[PDB]
Amino acid sequence: HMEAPILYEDPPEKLTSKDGRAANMKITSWNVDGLRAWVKKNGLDWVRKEDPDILCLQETKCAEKALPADITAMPEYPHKYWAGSEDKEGYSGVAMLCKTEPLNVTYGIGKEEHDKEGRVITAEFPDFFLVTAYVPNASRGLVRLDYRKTWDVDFRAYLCGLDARKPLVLCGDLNVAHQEIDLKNPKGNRKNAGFTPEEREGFTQLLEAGFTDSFRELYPDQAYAYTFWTYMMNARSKNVGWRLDYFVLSSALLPGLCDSKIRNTAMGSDHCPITLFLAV
Amino acid sequence: PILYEDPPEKLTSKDGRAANMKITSWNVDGLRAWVKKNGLDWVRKEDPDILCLQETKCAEKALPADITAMPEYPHKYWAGSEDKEGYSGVAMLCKTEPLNVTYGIGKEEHDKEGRVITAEFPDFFLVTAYVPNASRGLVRLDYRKTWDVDFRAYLCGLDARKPLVLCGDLNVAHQEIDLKNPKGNRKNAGFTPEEREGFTQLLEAGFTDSFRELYPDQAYAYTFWTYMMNARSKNVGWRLDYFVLSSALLPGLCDSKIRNTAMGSDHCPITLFLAV
Amino acid sequence: PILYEDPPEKLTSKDGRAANMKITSWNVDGLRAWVKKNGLDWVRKEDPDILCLQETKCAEKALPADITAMPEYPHKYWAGSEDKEGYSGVAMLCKTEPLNVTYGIGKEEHDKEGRVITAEFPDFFLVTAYVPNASRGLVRLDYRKTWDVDFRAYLCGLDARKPLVLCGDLNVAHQEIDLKNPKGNRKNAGFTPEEREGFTQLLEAGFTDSFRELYPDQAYAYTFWTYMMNARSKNVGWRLDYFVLSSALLPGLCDSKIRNTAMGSDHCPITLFLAV
Ligand SMILES: [Pb+2]
Numbered sequence: 001h002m003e004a005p006i007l008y009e010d011p012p013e014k015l016t017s018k019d020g021r022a023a024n025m026k027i028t029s030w031n032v033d034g035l036r037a038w039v040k041k042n043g044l045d046w047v048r049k050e051d052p053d054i055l056c057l058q059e060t061k062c063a064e065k066a067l068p069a070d071i072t073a074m075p076e077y078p079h080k081y082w083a084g085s086e087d088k089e090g091y092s093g094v095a096m097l098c099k100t101e102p103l104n105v106t107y108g109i110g111k112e113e114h115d116k117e118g119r120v121i122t123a124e125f126p127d128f129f130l131v132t133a134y135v136p137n138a139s140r141g142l143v144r145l146d147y148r149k150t151w152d153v154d155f156r157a158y159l160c161g162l163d164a165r166k167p168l169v170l171c172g173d174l175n176v177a178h179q180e181i182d183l184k185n186p187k188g189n190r191k192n193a194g195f196t197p198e199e200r201e202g203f204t205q206l207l208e209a210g211f212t213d214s215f216r217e218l219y220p221d222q223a224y225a226y227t228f229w230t231y232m233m234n235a236r237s238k239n240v241g242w243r244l245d246y247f248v249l250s251s252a253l254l255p256g257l258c259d260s261k262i263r264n265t266a267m268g269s270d271h272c273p274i275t276l277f278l279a280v
Numbered sequence: 281p282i283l284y285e286d287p288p289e290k291l292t293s294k295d296g297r298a299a300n301m302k303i304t305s306w307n308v309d310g311l312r313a314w315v316k317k318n319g320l321d322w323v324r325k326e327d328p329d330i331l332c333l334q335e336t337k338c339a340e341k342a343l344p345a346d347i348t349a350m351p352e353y354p355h356k357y358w359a360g361s362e363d364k365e366g367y368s369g370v371a372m373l374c375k376t377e378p379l380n381v382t383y384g385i386g387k388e389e390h391d392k393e394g395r396v397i398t399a400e401f402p403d404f405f406l407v408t409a410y411v412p413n414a415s416r417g418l419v420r421l422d423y424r425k426t427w428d429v430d431f432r433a434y435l436c437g438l439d440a441r442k443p444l445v446l447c448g449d450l451n452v453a454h455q456e457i458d459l460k461n462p463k464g465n466r467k468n469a470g471f472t473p474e475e476r477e478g479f480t481q482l483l484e485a486g487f488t489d490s491f492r493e494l495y496p497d498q499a500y501a502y503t504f505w506t507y508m509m510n511a512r513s514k515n516v517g518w519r520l521d522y523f524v525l526s527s528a529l530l531p532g533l534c535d536s537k538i539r540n541t542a543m544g545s546d547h548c549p550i551t552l553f554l555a556v
Numbered sequence: 557p558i559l560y561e562d563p564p565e566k567l568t569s570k571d572g573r574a575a576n577m578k579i580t581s582w583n584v585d586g587l588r589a590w591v592k593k594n595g596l597d598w599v600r601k602e603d604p605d606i607l608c609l610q611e612t613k614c615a616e617k618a619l620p621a622d623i624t625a626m627p628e629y630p631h632k633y634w635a636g637s638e639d640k641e642g643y644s645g646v647a648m649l650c651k652t653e654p655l656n657v658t659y660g661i662g663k664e665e666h667d668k669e670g671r672v673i674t675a676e677f678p679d680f681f682l683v684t685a686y687v688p689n690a691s692r693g694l695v696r697l698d699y700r701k702t703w704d705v706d707f708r709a710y711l712c713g714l715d716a717r718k719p720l721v722l723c724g725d726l727n728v729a730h731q732e733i734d735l736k737n738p739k740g741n742r743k744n745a746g747f748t749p750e751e752r753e754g755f756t757q758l759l760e761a762g763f764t765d766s767f768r769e770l771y772p773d774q775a776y777a778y779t780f781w782t783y784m785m786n787a788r789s790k791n792v793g794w795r796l797d798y799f800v801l802s803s804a805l806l807p808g809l810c811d812s813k814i815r816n817t818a819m820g821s822d823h824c825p826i827t828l829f830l831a832v
Pocket residue numbers: 033059
């Protein structure tokens with residue numbers, strides 16, 4: 001006897017926006033869990049196959065100085081930004097590789113007590129902001145849940161601030177499976193980092209601040225769609241995972257939303273990449 | 281076993297003026313225990329103009345008569361942890377009554393514990409502080425990063441309207457020269473990158489590490505030694521106690537001492553000589 | 557027969573930190589024979605965070621599915637000999653993927669046998685090695701001497717960047733206390749003055765023999781016994797397997813065990829508890 005595994009097949013790409021336009025922008029987000037290793041595992045090959053206009057990475061865990069030439073020298077993205085690229089904090093680090101240079105790129109969220117770890121890069125474009133983030137994990141024994149609660153409050157404030165100026169796309173590893181449909185075992189994880197009531201509420205509040213979970217908006221009933229699987233116990237081959245990676249959009253960008261895909265087929269990390277298709 | 285002898289006192293300042301202000305700071309590791317270990321005897325011998333104590337861990341109510349009755353310091357100020365507990369705590373004993381004394385840094389979340397006392401004198405502000413320890417497994421590190429930001433802002437504020445002297449256990453070895461084993465303590469409270477950067481930011485805000493200013497190449501000079509591993513007898517310690525001065529006070533700086541000979545705690549006292 | 561009982565596990569470091577890293581090293585004397593002898597069963601009981609194996613003598617293509625498919629260790633690394641030879645071969649199985657894994661010590665002279673794997677983690681380097689045996693009649697003692705020099709240089713290179721933990725069969729009983737019959741083996745591989753000196757030189761380069769550091773007077777503690785003459789039953793063995801730490805890591809050292817009751821090879825495993 002045994003319980004059968006329920007696999008997920010990402011639907012075909014919808015290349016038409018809500019308001020009828022053709023997709024002309026492609027943004028990919030990927031928690032690479034150690035960029036050096038991800039690169040050796042050929043992650044860049046997949047990136048070239050996806051050929052996104054903007055590539056956002058989380059958990060690079062590599063000081064900018066230690067970045068392999070394979071990625072810093074990529075012709076595809078003449079504008080690369082690295083954060084937390086500190087060797088001393090090898091448990092963070094984010095990056096944004098753009099084909100087009102933004103108006104301005106900032107690091108962190110304007111709160112020095114939060115910006116010591118490279119978790120957020122914000123690129124400003126004429127029409128909107130692109131924010132990629134590696135949210136603080138509540139960690140083992142929830143020993144960092146208090147800080148995570150403060151972070152959610154501050155990060156939300158920061159996002160609402162930006163939203164007041166221009167619409168924005170928030171993407172990355174938000175270290176939270178919003179609802180039960182967002183993870184295989186909600187019962188056994190309610191006291192674990194990523195699925196505590198507090199983290200879930202924080203995300204609910206962010207959405208109620210005027211933002212939308214792109215994937216959930218397009219597929220409100222699609223279960224078993226995850227972006228993370230613990231490397232342990234062949235979890236991925238059984239599709240026993242969590243949906244921790246999102247593309248959250250401010251209301252004004254929904255008309256331009258075409259699709260929000262989960263490339264659960266791309267290997268190289270315990271997270272798979274997610275791709276957003278927009279009409280801008 | 282490299283040892284360290286503190287140089288002889290330099291009673292002449294940068295601009296020539298003779299030292300005329302003597303300030304001592306000391307993490308007493310429990311004021312009640314420290315007093316029983318004859319801490320006050322050393323104080324009377326050092327005879328500072330102002331005594332700043334950190335980690336007193338004793339609510340006023342419970343303060344021992346031996347210290348509250350000291351006739352040498354008529355003006356005493358105690359900062360305890362609001363919750364009437366006796367956690368942390370700092371004190372400042374003076375021979376001269378300051379123009380004004382305040383507690384905390386104007387931040388409820390931080391003023392919940394007794395960590396700061398600001399005494400305003402005609403020439404300068406004297407701020408003594410017991411900075412939050414990141415603690416075991418760096419569990420309070422995030423809290424510490426927030427403290428560092430707010431405390432810095434607070435100090436900059438005071439520095440804007442008057443020169444200040446900051447003293448106490450800042451719970452951080454700024455550079456590698458500030459501790460015996462930097463390599464193995466990277467993930468230890470007091471030597472994390474976040475804590476180091478925090479101190480650098482404070483200095484970059486217009487402040488000077490008195491001791492390092494006077495002895496930039498002097499190593500093995502520590503103010504802390506873990507009670508464990510017989511660290512002190514081997515001088516395997518950290519430099520966690522400082523006298524951080526506003527630029528304007530540099531001319532009057534005479535010397536910054538480390539009395540590693542005084543016992544009674546896992547921290548030794550530090551004394552500052554100023555010409556104000 | 558003078559036997560040895562390994563003391564209970566100590567899970568707190570010298571500086572007071574609770575163990576957060578468990579590493580096991582084991583010379584399996586042929587991975588294939590070992591797996592069949594149920595070595596993995598024991599491995600699952602010990603359940604270390606990282607498992608290092610030496611003398612695997614098995615091409616990756618020939619590895620038994622029983623080990624390559626262990627769900628417990630998602631990240632496995634194999635270092636075999638050039639043409640799938642049965643000489644040496646080491647492996648490292650990790651629960652957490654390291655930042656970077658490299659093979660050999662940067663010298664084709666020594667990297668033709670799969671003797672070393674270096675895993676770089678955020679706070680330290682984990683190196684597992686299978687040191688070249690001086691072999692029969694010391695016919696390979698010269699090469700071994702060359703090896704000790706380069707390997708020491710290699711470890712020093714890494715140490716200058718990050719602290720490291722070195723584990724594996726280092727093929728040497730450091731001192732007389734590390735083997736049952738010192739006098740009879742002074743001219744045999746593993747106890748020549750040269751090999752001993754080499755190990756001594758390594759420690760003086762800034763490293764510590766974990767086990768001897770915790771139990772300086774503990775005799776009869778071995779990790780190897782020849783299969784012949786019931787050596788293991790009489791506990792006539794050698795201590796050839798170590799956990800050598802950058803001295804900086806000492807305060808983080810909790811315990812260094814010798815699991816002499818675990819069977820399956822002519823070596824028993826050793827386990828290290830660390831606070832990283
Ligand atoms: Pb990770």
